[PDB]
Design a protein around this ligand. Sequence first.
Ligand code: SF4
Ligand code: NI
Ligand code: NI
Length: 728
Amino acid sequence: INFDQIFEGAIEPGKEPKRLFKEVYEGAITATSYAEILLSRAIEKYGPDHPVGYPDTAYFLPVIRAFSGEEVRTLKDMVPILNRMRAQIKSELTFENARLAGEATWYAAEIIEALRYLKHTPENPIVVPPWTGFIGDPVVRQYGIKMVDWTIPGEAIIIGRAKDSKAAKKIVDDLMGKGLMLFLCDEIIEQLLEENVKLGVDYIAYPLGNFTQVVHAANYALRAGLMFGGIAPGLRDAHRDYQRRRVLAFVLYLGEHDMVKTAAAMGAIFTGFPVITDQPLPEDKQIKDWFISEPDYDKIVQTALEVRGIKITSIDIDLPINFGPAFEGESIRKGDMHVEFGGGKTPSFELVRMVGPDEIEDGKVEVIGPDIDSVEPGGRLPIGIVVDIYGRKMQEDFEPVLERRIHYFTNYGEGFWHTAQRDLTWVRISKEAFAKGARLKHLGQLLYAKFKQEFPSIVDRVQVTIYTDEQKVLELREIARKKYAERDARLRELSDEAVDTYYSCLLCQSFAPTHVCIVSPERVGLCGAISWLDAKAAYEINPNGPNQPIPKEGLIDPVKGQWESFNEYIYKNSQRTIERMNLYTIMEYPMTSCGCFEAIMAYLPELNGFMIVNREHSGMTPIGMTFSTLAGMVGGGTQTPGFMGIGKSYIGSRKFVKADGGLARVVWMPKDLKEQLRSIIEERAEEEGLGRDFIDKIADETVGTTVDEVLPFLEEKGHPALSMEPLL
Ligand code: SF4
Ligand code: NI
Ligand code: NI
C-alpha cells in the first residue's frame, strides 16, 4: 500500500518548486523548536511524569495516535517523538521531504496544543467561546459519520484572513450554505463575527483559534479513521488512505503566507488534502493540484470543491418555515396537529410519474381544492401528491427510487411529518407550521426542489400537484393504483434464478468497514430499504457509487449458494477479512451485518430451530439475550455462524434461509412481528406444505422467553422443526 502514488506525476523531474520547499522546511524547523522548548519548560515546571492531554477524548493526541501510534499520556512521552520528528525534517528539497515536514509540523502543533491544555480545567477553560479549541469525541462521533458517509459533502479548513469581511463572509456564507463543515483558523473568525455571521458546533462552523490551533481540524479528521474506519493506531498509510477517500477536506489559506501556516498547509497535503490560497503564487512556490492560487474571491470556493472532487449543486425553495433533515422525526400529536392527511381517516395517495418534455412546466405547482387556510383547525382533508418528471437520461425504472424520497423530503421542513407510502400515507402539519405561513403550494416547493437537487443527471424538469379535493383524490388514486400494480408487479416477478447479476452495497462501510451486503431478488438488504431493483437503479443512476453489479460466476455450492464471484468481491471489499459467503444459510459463512438490521435470527440447538427477534422488540428472547445485546455480537461486519441480521421481508422470501430448512425452521418470534407478517407467513407456509395454520405453531413471548418454557408448546403443536435434522 503505497499511499504516495497519489503524488506521482505531480511535478516534473525539474520544476520542483524550491521556493515552497524552503518555506515549509524553515517553518517546520520552527514549529518543532517551539514544541521542543515549550516541552522542556513544561517538564521543568511539572515533572516528566506529569499527565498531559486533551479533554474529552479517548484518543490521547489523535494525530500522533493515528500516524505512528504512541498513546501520549505524560510529558516524558513527547520527548522521543519530537526527536524523531526533528530527524525527519530534511534539507533536500523534495516533495517528499516537504510532506514529511508537513507531518512533523502537525506533530509539533499537536504537542504544543496539548501542552497548552495543561492549564485547562472545566472551571478555568483556556480557549473559551466563541472558539472551540480541541473539539471533543462526542461531536466527532455525532457529526463525523455524517462526514465520512458524505451527507456533509466536504470540509473547509480556513486558515488566515480574507481580503476583507465582505470577502470572507461571502465565501463562508455560501460554502457554508452548500452544507459543508468548517474549521476556522485565525483571523477570519474575527472578520466573520464582525459581520454577525453566527457559527459554532450547532452550525458545524468551527472557530478553532489561531496559531497551532489549526491542528484541531487534523485531530478531528484523524479521529474519524480511528473511530469509524477501525484503523489500528499506527497504520500510517492506512490512515492517510482513509483521510483521502472519506474526508473531503481542503484548505483555504487566505492572507499572506507565513512559514508555519504554509508548513501546516503542507501537512494537510501529506495526508491528501489540497491547499487553495488567496495569494497569487509564482511558479516556484506551487504544486499543480496540491498547492494552488485562485485570487478571484468568486472562484476559490467553486474552485476548491472542484479540485477536491466535491460535487454538489443547490436548490432554492424560499419558504415560511424551517427546512432540512434535522426537522425530521418531528412528531405531530392531535394536540398540535393543525390538519391531518391520509391515515385511516381521509383519502390519501402519492405518485412520481415519468413524462415527455413537451408536457411539463418546470416549476409549475398546483393545489386543486381548499389549501391549508381553507380548513378547520384539527381538520382532516384528502390529498394526492403527483410529481411528474422528465429527463434525458430518465427511466420508468427510477420512478420507485424517486417516489420513495417523498416521506424523507416531506419530513425535512419543520412543522411537517409524513408516514407510510402510497395510498397508505399518513401526513400531519403542526399549528406552528400553518402559523409561520405554511401553505399547500409549499409542499410542491420543498419537493420539486429536492428531486432536482438529488438527481442531477437524469432529471431535467419537475412539476408537483397536491389535491385536497375529495373528488380529485379518488380519481387519481385509481390511476396510480394502476402504477402501483404495474410496479409492485415488477418486484414479485423477479427471482434469484431469473437474473444472473446481483448487486453489492457498500453504503454502511461508513460505520462497518468490513461489511459488504449482497442484494439479490429474493433477499432484500438487511436495513430493509434496498431491494435488488433499488440497487440496480442506483448503480445505473451512479455507475461509480456504492452499489455495483456482480455476475454469478464460478459456482461453488448450488445449495448453500456460494459463488467465487461473490466471494472475491467480498474478500476484496472487507479488507480481506471474509473469504466465503453462502447466500442460503446462516450456519456456515453467513453474510455479515452492519448495525441497521431490522431483525436478528439465531439458531437454538435446544429447540432445533430459529428464533427471530425484531429491532423494536424489547423482551427477553430464548437465547438469554435481548435484541440490543445480540445486536452487539451480530453487527460490525464479522461472520457469525448461527446468527444473522436480516430485513423483515426476507422472512417471507421463498429463498429464506432455504439451505437450512426455510420457514419451517422458525420456532419463536415476537407476537407483534408474527402478526405484522401474518399474511406472508400464511401464504409461504401454504406453498411450503406446512399448512394454513403453521403460524399458530410458532411460539412467541406469550408462550415463553426461555427454551424450557417453549419446548412443551412446540411439542403440543407438533411444530415441524422438531422432526427435521438438527442443524448443529
Ligand atoms: S444494510 Fe446493506 S443494503 Fe442496506 S444501506 Fe447498509 S450496506 Fe446497503
Ligand atoms: Ni446495519
Ligand atoms: Ni446498514
